[PDB]
RNA sequence: CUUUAAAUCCUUUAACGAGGAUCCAUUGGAGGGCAAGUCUGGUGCCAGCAGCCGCGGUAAUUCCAGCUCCAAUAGCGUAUA
């Protein structure tokens, strides 16, 4: 009798077929194009899309003009709009079954920083996110798998402690200066 | 820099061994003259003695 | 080791080469009474007897060893003893002077299992002369 | 020959060689993208059986 | 099904019970004779004592001789035949040694060309046999 | 001098049959040996 | 047919003689030590040569068990009496052109 | 510095701290299922591999060792229910 939780669920899912050409082809294509680490995060993005698709199928199973159907139909559509992946004009319940993995991966923090033009490459963007340089509305984020909301898209900039956004120079810069006045004097 | 060998696993304990025999040596150079340990006596003999 | 002797007494046969004395024959057939002198090895109960010069035909199984009508179990080399030999059941009885004579040197019939049995644990009672006799009975019985 | 049933025969009498230079890693960002663009851009699909990436023939 | 009536269910249930009882894997898994006759006693791994080393012949198309170990089990006390897994590994073990034994992966059946052997050797003398093969660990003295 | 010592350490030892050759862990450490001798017999092979 | 190289014993071989023929692809041979051994047919000797009874056979000894062993190669008549003349076999070994009396 | 009965754990912050950034990522496989070399050298129905087909007979796309390659990745393989 302890005060614990014991509440945990799996986020990714393992596919049924272990070896196949084409599945590996677009999985490697998505990993290479979006700068992902390995297949676990694309499997968990597939699992989140599977959850949303199952909820949409269950909600469309129920008949029209039921208050529960309208209730979490409006809730799910409002959540998908607030993420920003869904367009405002596509305000319909059966449009949930018409988007794919790259739409969810478009709202990643890594590719949002890469499209903002303050980073050179996608892997350079992932390193720059990973190494505590970008704040999200006066709050630094060091992880790449961050879902940027639509309201927070226009408030992404460098950290004030980072040397890129204005601050103290880095460790190798002062070491280079110390070597410079060591060799000069 | 080349101070130790290629792997630090067999070179890291050398400083620890140097400190444990210098602790052994120093404990043998600061010694007391009186109030030493308790000696041992050793009873032996034949059966039915 | 006492129990090992008791249930391995029949399977263990000591080697023995025996020299026959002339004209000391009493019974020629059923049983075999012949006063025969030990020249090599030792004689025990149940030891078979054969002839090497007559393509290895067994004589019979012994019953008792008598030294001047006194039953002695073990007889060493150089003693004139009297041995009562009985024919084996299932085979025909033998007679003296026709099947075998007094001009033949008699040896004990031994088996390779008996040699192995004397090798494994019988180190105490098997001497250097008995080892040489073991080598000779290996070299005469066409066994390796 | 020695004997038929002596264990570790071909393990014992085989020759011994050493290793080579250390390879690098990019955690599959170009480690598998190199074989992807080898199979896509470099190697053309020839009408036949197959054409593998490790085919040293 | 065939007997299709609204107010009957126990006939279907009893027929399904009898037809499920008249099976092979269900009859093996739900009887005490199969677990009693199992040398492992329903365990994945077990420990035993090495007492003999023998060599069995293979099947007809595959002509070789395999090195296998006679092992007496600790929990039960009956002899089995166990097969050492990898090349050059019979010399790594000797007589009168504790050993860890496990099945091949056919749920208690012979695998390949080896007759009468359904178990394999994993660990001997509380050290892994794979580390003994690959030289990662040195054998106890 | 008897006041400064931190007590005394006592080792008892075997010496029956099949025990006289286990003095490696009994005699290689004890400083002052004491030999109890019986005057009825005197010398013994294990004592010498 | 051709006079090949006559091989001697190395570490693990012994000159045996077959005294009784076994079925199911197995063989029984009498080695020249005094004990009994059971023999198995080589995979290279599966049908190329038919080993009969009462002939000199080369058997490979096994160290962890001395009851089961394996044959190697067959000596038929001429290398048999030539190596008999070399003196490895003793006088007690009879070939006598396959006589069954012993 | 903070937390804490008092510390340790996390976070913040001085001074250190990376170029082959040796501050070195393994685990199983490469005939079919089933991603992946008719590569090189050795024993040549022996040693062995192999869940199943089957590979081993002195040209081994399967054994035993080096090079390359694929699979998942701080994780991977085996046996049991």
TrEMBL record, chain C:
Origin superkingdom: Eukaryota
Signal peptide: none
Cellular compartment(s): Cytoplasm
Transmembrane region(s): none
Cited function: Plays a role in translation initiation. Ribosome-dependent GTPase that promotes the joining of the 60S ribosomal subunit to the pre-initiation complex to form the 80S initiation complex with the initiator methionine-tRNA in the P-site base paired to the start codon. Together with eIF1A (EIF1AX), actively orients the initiator methionine-tRNA in a conformation that allows 60S ribosomal subunit joining to form the 80S initiation complex. Is released after formation of the 80S initiation complex.
Subunit structure as annotated in this protein's UniProt entry: Interacts through its C-terminal domain (CTD) with the CTD of eIF1A (EIF1AX) or with the CTD of EIF5 (mutually exclusive) through a common binding site. Interacts with eIF1A (EIF1AX) from the location of the start codon by the 43S complex until the formation of the 80S complex. Interacts with ANXA5 in a calcium and phospholipid-dependent manner.
Family from the record: Belongs to the TRAFAC class translation factor GTPase superfamily. Classic translation factor GTPase family. IF-2 subfamily.
Protein name: Eukaryotic translation initiation factor 5B
Annotated organism of origin: Oryctolagus cuniculus (Rabbit)
Parent-protein start and end of this portion: 1121 to 1264 of 1264
């Amino acid at each position: 009798p302890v005060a614990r939780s014991w509440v945990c669920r799996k986020t990714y899912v393992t596919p049924r077929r272990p070896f196949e050409k084409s599945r590996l082809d677009q999985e490697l294509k998505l990993i290479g194009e979006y700068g992902l680490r390995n297949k676990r995060e694309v499997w968990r993005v597939k699992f989140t899309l599977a959850k949303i698709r199952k909820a949409a199928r269950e909600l469309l199973t129920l008949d029209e003009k039921d208050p529960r159907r309208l209730f979490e139909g409006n809730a799910l559509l409002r959540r998908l709009v607030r993420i920003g992946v869904l367009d405002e004009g596509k305000m319909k319940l059966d449009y949930i079954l018409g988007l794919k993995i790259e739409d969810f991966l478009e709202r990643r923090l890594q590719t949002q920083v890469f499209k903002l033009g303050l980073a050179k490459s996608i892997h350079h963007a992932r390193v720059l996110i990973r190494q505590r340089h970008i704040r999200v509305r006066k709050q630094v984020v060091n992880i790449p798998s961050f879902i940027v909301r639509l309201d927070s898209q226009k408030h992404i900039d460098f950290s004030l402690r980072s040397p890129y956004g204005g601050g103290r120079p880095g460790r190798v810069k002062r070491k280079n200066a110390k070597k410079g006045q060591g060799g000069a004097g | 820099d080349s101070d130790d060998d290629r792997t630090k696993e067999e070179r890291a304990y050398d400083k620890a061994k140097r400190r444990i025999e210098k602790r052994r040596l120093e404990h043998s150079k600061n010694v007391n003259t009186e109030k030493l340990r308790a000696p041992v006596i050793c009873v032996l003999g034949h059966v039915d003695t | 080791k006492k129990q090992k002797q008791e249930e391995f007494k029949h399977i263990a046969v000591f080697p023995c080469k025996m020299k026959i004395l002339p004209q000391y024959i009493f019974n020629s057939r059923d049983p075999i009474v012949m006063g025969v002198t030990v020249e090599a090895g030792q004689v025990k109960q149940g030891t078979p007897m054969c002839v090497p010069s007559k393509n290895f035909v067994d004589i019979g199984i012994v019953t008792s060893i008598e030294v001047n009508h006194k039953q002695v179990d073990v007889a060493k080399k150089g003693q004139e003893v009297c041995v009562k030999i009985e024919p084996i059941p299932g085979e025909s009885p033998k007679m003296f002077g026709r099947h075998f004579e007094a001009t033949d040197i008699l040896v004990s019939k031994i088996s390779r299992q008996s040699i192995d049995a004397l090798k494994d644990w019988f180190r105490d009672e098997m001497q250097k002369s008995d080892w040489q006799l073991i080598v000779e009975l290996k070299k005469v019985f066409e066994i390796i | 020959h020695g004997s038929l049933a002596r264990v570790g025969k071909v393990r014992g009498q085989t020759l011994k060689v050493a290793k080579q230079e250390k390879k690098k890693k990019r955690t599959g960002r170009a480690k598998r993208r190199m074989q992807y663009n080898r199979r896509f851009v470099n190697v053309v699909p020839t009408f036949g059986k197959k054409k593998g990436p490790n085919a040293n023939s | 099904g065939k007997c299709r009536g609204l107010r009957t269910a126990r006939k279907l249930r009893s027929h399904r019970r009898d037809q499920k009882w008249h099976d092979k894997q269900y009859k093996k898994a739900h009887l005490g004779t199969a677990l009693k006759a199992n040398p492992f006693g329903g365990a994945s791994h077990a420990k035993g004592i090495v007492l003999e080393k023998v060599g069995v012949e293979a099947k007809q198309p595959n002509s070789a001789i395999r090195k296998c170990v006679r092992v007496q089990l600790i929990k039960n006390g009956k002899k089995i035949t166990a097969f050492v897994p990898n090349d050059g590994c019979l010399n790594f073990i000797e007589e009168n040694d504790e050993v860890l034994v496990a099945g091949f992966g056919r749920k208690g059946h012979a695998v390949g060309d080896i007759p009468g052997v359904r178990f394999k050797v994993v660990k001997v003398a509380n050290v892994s046999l794979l580390a003994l093969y690959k030289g990662k660990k040195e054998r106890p003295r | 001098e008897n006041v400064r010592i931190p007590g005394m350490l006592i080792i008892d030892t075997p010496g029956h049959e099949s025990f006289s050759n286990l003095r490696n862990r009994g005699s290689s450490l004890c400083d002052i040996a004491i030999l109890v001798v019986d005057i009825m017999h005197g010398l013994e092979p294990q004592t010498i | 047919s051709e006079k090949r190289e006559l091989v001697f014993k190395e570490d693990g071989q012994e000159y045996a003689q077959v005294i009784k023929m076994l079925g199911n692809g197995r063989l029984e041979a009498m080695c020249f030590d005094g004990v009994k051994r059971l023999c198995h047919i080589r995979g290279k000797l599966r049908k190329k040569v038919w080993i009969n009874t009462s002939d000199i056979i080369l058997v490979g000894l096994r160290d962890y068990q001395d009851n089961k062993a394996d044959v190697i190669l067959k000596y038929n008549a001429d290398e048999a009496r030539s190596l008999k003349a070399y003196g490895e076999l003793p006088e007690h070994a009879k070939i006598n052109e396959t006589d069954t009396f012993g």
